Amino acid sequence: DKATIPSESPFAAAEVADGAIVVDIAKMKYETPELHVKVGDTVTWINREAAPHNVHFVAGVLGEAALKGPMMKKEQAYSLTFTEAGTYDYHCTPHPFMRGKVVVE
């Protein structure tokens, strides 16, 4: 795989790790829709809205399987630690008009 998952389920926004690269989900959008990080960085999405959101990478992007992240409730967070260079597109499962990408380089 090209990312590891610290926590399979969401955790509180206040529990964000030191050094994590935060993407806010606000105004119905990934507020940083194209993020550039280095190998080994942890990206943490934080849902700021009442509507639940996730991140969803189709099969063949982060690895063989799709990575369908857990639904984050308001003020919950979810992390992926990227371990390989590449370009990784994702969307929100219930709201597929929400699109983002992580470029690892």
Contact track, Cu ion, 85-104, x by CB under 5 A: -------x--x--x------
Nearest alpha-carbon partner for 30 in 82, 101, 85? 101
CB 95 within 8 A of CB 84: no
- As measured in angstroms, the least distance from the Cβ of 105 to Cu ion is 26
Judged by CB under 5 A, the chain residues 44 through 83 that form the site for Cu ion are 53
CB 35 within 8 A of CB 103: yes
Ligand-binding site membership of 56 (annotated)? no
- As measured in angstroms, the least distance from the Cβ of 39 to Cu ion is 27
Distance CA 88, CA 58 (A): 9
Residues lying near Cu ion in the complex (CB under 5 A) are found at 53, 92, 95, 98
Q: Which residues sit in the known binding site?
A: 53, 92, 95, 98
